[PDB]
Scaffold this active site. Structure first.
Site, PDB file in Angstrom:
ATOM      1  N   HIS A 126       0.855  -1.205   0.000  1.00  0.00           N
ATOM      2  CA  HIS A 126       0.000   0.000   0.000  1.00  0.00           C
ATOM      3  C   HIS A 126       0.881   1.241   0.000  1.00  0.00           C
ATOM      4  O   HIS A 126       2.083   1.095  -0.096  1.00  0.00           O
ATOM      5  CB  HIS A 126      -1.034   0.002   1.143  1.00  0.00           C
ATOM      6  N   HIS A 157       1.672   3.802   1.961  1.00  0.00           N
ATOM      7  CA  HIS A 157       2.312   4.470   3.123  1.00  0.00           C
ATOM      8  C   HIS A 157       3.842   4.272   3.071  1.00  0.00           C
ATOM      9  O   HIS A 157       4.324   3.332   2.434  1.00  0.00           O
ATOM     10  CB  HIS A 157       1.744   3.941   4.435  1.00  0.00           C
ATOM     11  N   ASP A 160       6.090   2.843   5.176  1.00  0.00           N
ATOM     12  CA  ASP A 160       6.671   1.531   5.567  1.00  0.00           C
ATOM     13  C   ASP A 160       6.570   0.530   4.408  1.00  0.00           C
ATOM     14  O   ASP A 160       6.989  -0.701   4.578  1.00  0.00           O
ATOM     15  CB  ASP A 160       6.068   1.010   6.880  1.00  0.00           C
ATOM     16  N   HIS A 164      -6.910  -1.492   6.366  1.00  0.00           N
ATOM     17  CA  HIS A 164      -5.938  -0.519   6.891  1.00  0.00           C
ATOM     18  C   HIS A 164      -5.881   0.691   5.936  1.00  0.00           C
ATOM     19  O   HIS A 164      -5.685   1.839   6.364  1.00  0.00           O
ATOM     20  CB  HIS A 164      -4.574  -1.240   7.017  1.00  0.00           C
ATOM     21  N   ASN A 187      -2.291   3.059  13.137  1.00  0.00           N
ATOM     22  CA  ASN A 187      -2.590   4.197  12.233  1.00  0.00           C
ATOM     23  C   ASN A 187      -3.842   3.799  11.458  1.00  0.00           C
ATOM     24  O   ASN A 187      -3.725   2.896  10.625  1.00  0.00           O
ATOM     25  CB  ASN A 187      -1.425   4.494  11.287  1.00  0.00           C
TER      26      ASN A 187
HETATM   27  N1  LIG Z   1      -4.713   6.159  14.654  1.00  0.00           N
HETATM   28  C1  LIG Z   1      -5.099   7.121  13.683  1.00  0.00           C
HETATM   29  N2  LIG Z   1      -6.329   7.322  13.481  1.00  0.00           N
HETATM   30  N3  LIG Z   1      -4.240   7.916  13.031  1.00  0.00           N
HETATM   31  N4  LIG Z   1      -2.874   7.932  13.306  1.00  0.00           N
HETATM   32  C2  LIG Z   1      -2.010   8.752  12.696  1.00  0.00           C
HETATM   33  O1  LIG Z   1      -2.455   9.610  11.938  1.00  0.00           O
HETATM   34  N5  LIG Z   1      -0.665   8.574  12.816  1.00  0.00           N
HETATM   35  C3  LIG Z   1      -0.125   7.402  13.275  1.00  0.00           C
HETATM   36  C4  LIG Z   1      -0.830   6.458  14.208  1.00  0.00           C
HETATM   37  F1  LIG Z   1      -1.998   6.707  14.814  1.00  0.00           F
HETATM   38  C5  LIG Z   1      -0.278   5.254  14.542  1.00  0.00           C
HETATM   39  C6  LIG Z   1       0.934   4.859  14.009  1.00  0.00           C
HETATM   40  S1  LIG Z   1       1.415   3.408  14.474  1.00  0.00           S
HETATM   41  O2  LIG Z   1       0.708   2.993  15.669  1.00  0.00           O
HETATM   42  O3  LIG Z   1       2.861   3.461  14.636  1.00  0.00           O
HETATM   43  N6  LIG Z   1       1.019   2.441  13.251  1.00  0.00           N
HETATM   44  C7  LIG Z   1       1.850   2.272  12.189  1.00  0.00           C
HETATM   45  S2  LIG Z   1       3.391   2.991  11.934  1.00  0.00           S
HETATM   46  C8  LIG Z   1       3.607   2.190  10.394  1.00  0.00           C
HETATM   47  N7  LIG Z   1       2.580   1.383  10.130  1.00  0.00           N
HETATM   48  C9  LIG Z   1       1.537   1.402  11.036  1.00  0.00           C
HETATM   49  C10 LIG Z   1       0.346   0.517  10.988  1.00  0.00           C
HETATM   50  O4  LIG Z   1      -0.605   0.478  11.846  1.00  0.00           O
HETATM   51  O5  LIG Z   1       0.402  -0.313  10.038  1.00  0.00           O
HETATM   52  C11 LIG Z   1       1.662   5.661  13.106  1.00  0.00           C
HETATM   53  C12 LIG Z   1       1.169   6.913  12.710  1.00  0.00           C
HETATM   54  F2  LIG Z   1       1.869   7.688  11.857  1.00  0.00           F
HETATM   55 ZN   LIG Z   2      -0.128   1.954   6.303  1.00  0.00          ZN
HETATM   56 ZN   LIG Z   3       2.230  -0.281   8.886  1.00  0.00          ZN
END
Ligand SMILES: N=C(N)NNC(=O)Nc1c(F)cc(S(=O)(=O)Nc2scnc2C(=O)O)cc1F
Ligand SMILES: [Zn+2]
Ligand SMILES: [Zn+2]
Ligand SMILES: [Zn+2]
Length: 232
Positions: free
Chosen positions: A83, A85, A87, A148, A179
């Site tokens: 996708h 993003h 990563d 996602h 995220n």
């Molecule tokens: N949870 C909301 N609504 N929106 N979140 C965001 O705007 N930003 C954000 C977030 F909430 C959460 C994360 S995380 O928890 O590190 N998840 C990540 S980081 C890379 N990939 C992921 C993933 O889940 O796949 C990264 C982010 F950049």
């Molecule tokens: Zn993503």
């Molecule tokens: Zn991710």
């Protein structure tokens, strides 16, 4: 043996052999004071390799190519980003400079462009409708529907029964939504049900982040997504 965690990985990448001709790649990024790992896939394609996803940025992706070059010794000829993003596409320019053909769906290429992210060169046709599957050398690519992200793909290695879910599938240790800014929470469980119905034979399930398991990761993800949907 032991799956690599953050404690074993400083900019560095570890490879993990899941099955014959199938590896995960494991990298880390520092975000918001925490350190999070990320998984991708490496699938042998005769005497070449197919890479699934970057290692989350230019430096990690150059480390990934260096760690493949050292430990497997076969050329990466193609890469697919699951996708739009960072990563998944962050490091695409590094792959392209090394002579890797980078691929994503037109949906992913469009969203990467809107986001100002790196854009894989080549277009994957035949994936625009939920439940679409296409063969890509030693893997099947599957668009299960929005989860996602609206464009997320999952990857199955028929020879090894390895299902790579990318960020549409959560590890068991994740009990809260990640995220979900670009997520379709309403369609995510339906999309997981499409994955369950198409790959009921999968023996190894690799989440986008953290420890592999079996098909229980799909129900796990459904549970977490439903709990988030119902937040009061
Ligand atoms: N949870 C909301 N609504 N929106 N979140 C965001 O705007 N930003 C954000 C977030 F909430 C959460 C994360 S995380 O928890 O590190 N998840 C990540 S980081 C890379 N990939 C992921 C993933 O889940 O796949 C990264 C982010 F950049
Ligand atoms: Zn993503
Ligand atoms: Zn991710
Ligand atoms: Zn090309």
């Amino acid at each position: 043996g032991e799956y690599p965690t953050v404690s074993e990985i400083p900019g560095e990448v570890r490879l993990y052999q899941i099955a014959d001709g199938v590896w995960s790649h494991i990298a880390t990024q520092s975000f918001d004071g925490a350190v999070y790992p990320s998984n991708g896939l490496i699938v042998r394609d005769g005497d070449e390799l197919l890479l699934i996803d970057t290692a989350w940025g230019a430096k990690n992706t150059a480390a990934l190519l260096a760690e493949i070059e050292k430990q497997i010794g076969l050329p990466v000829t193609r890469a697919v980003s699951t996708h739009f993003h960072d990563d998944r596409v962050g490091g695409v320019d590094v792959l392209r400079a090394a002579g890797v053909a980078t691929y994503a769906s037109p949906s992913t290429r469009r969203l990467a462009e809107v986001e100002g992210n790196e854009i894989p060169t080549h277009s994957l046709e035949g994936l625009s409708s939920s439940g679409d599957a296409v063969r890509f050398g030693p893997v099947e690519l599957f668009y299960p529907g929005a989860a996602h992200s609206t464009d997320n793909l999952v990857v199955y290695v028929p020879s090894a029964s390895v299902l790579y879910g990318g960020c549409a599938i959560y590890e068991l240790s994740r009990t809260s939504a990640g995220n979900v800014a670009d997520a379709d929470l309403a369609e995510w469980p339906t999309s997981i049900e499409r994955i369950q119905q198409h790959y009921p034979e999968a023996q190894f399930v690799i989440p986008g982040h953290g420890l592999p398991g079996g098909l229980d990761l799909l129900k796990h993800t459904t549970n977490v997504v439903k709990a988030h949907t119902n937040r009061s």
